[PDB]
């Protein structure tokens, strides 16, 4: 029981993943940032708009094979110094 999941960035790119339905999604998330040269803290993973946590499993979030995960950048106006 591997499941394929699509991860869709805001720049239009799409990285596919085959993963165990009970593996924590953190494995997926780390591979994704490393590959895209992204900083974990600056990005959010969402499944139909809802938080996916490192500790979450695809089965626990009831994803189905072929499903799409979004990654968004953080939203913050400014930087206080």
């Amino acid at each position: 029981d591997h499941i394929n999941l699509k991860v869709a960035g805001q720049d239009g790119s799409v990285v596919q993943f085959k993963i165990k339905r009970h593996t924590p999604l953190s494995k997926l998330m780390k591979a994704y940032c490393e590959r895209q040269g992204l900083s974990m803290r600056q990005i959010r993973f969402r499944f139909d708009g809802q938080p996916i946590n490192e500790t979450d499993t695809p089965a626990q979030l009831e994803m189905e094979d072929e499903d799409t995960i979004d990654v968004f950048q953080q939203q913050t106006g400014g930087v206080y110094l």
Partner: protein
Amino acid sequence: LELTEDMEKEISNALGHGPQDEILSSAPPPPAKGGLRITRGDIQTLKNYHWLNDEVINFYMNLLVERNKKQGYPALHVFSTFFYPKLKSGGYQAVKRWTKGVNLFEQEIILVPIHRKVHWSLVVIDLRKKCLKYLDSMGQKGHRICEILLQYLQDESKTKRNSDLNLLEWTHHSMKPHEIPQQLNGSDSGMFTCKYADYISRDKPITFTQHQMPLFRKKMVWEILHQQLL
């Protein structure tokens, strides 16, 4: 609200030094399916003069949904802060699933938090009165945002209910010049958005001013830690 010495203390602890990634509150908490979270880094965006980030905003909007239910206030649906840019950029099909298992048209008030180039603003969709209003603490107009939002409602309704809206019975408002601006600080734009949403969700006239924000930021750190609005 003048705060307790213990309140002060716990708030100062949540904002002070420690691991940025340390998770300070989750809703619902472990074990629950994901699961909004606030780490120390996110809750620090409530320090005075700092800009709030999406994680504070979404966590607070969501406490308003819970509070409204507990108090007999109107049925509230809040969209993610990621919902609007995704709908703007990619159309209805891109967000249709973001209401799975919910009948949007059986709620009474819908809040759409909007992150614009550098500041937060809010769209309120009042289903009781078929009205959309754009509230923006820097006094920007959002009749464009509103029309994109209204189109989404017709698209939801046709898809989920197989019925059509009559978009002529629906109307946009932007606030008039003195219905609470502050452009002096877009730092407080996220706090204005969250307080706008808190009052609007209760049918309460919006009477707070810029002077209250620093206290509101401290209150909100305790509200978030305790998942309970004061």
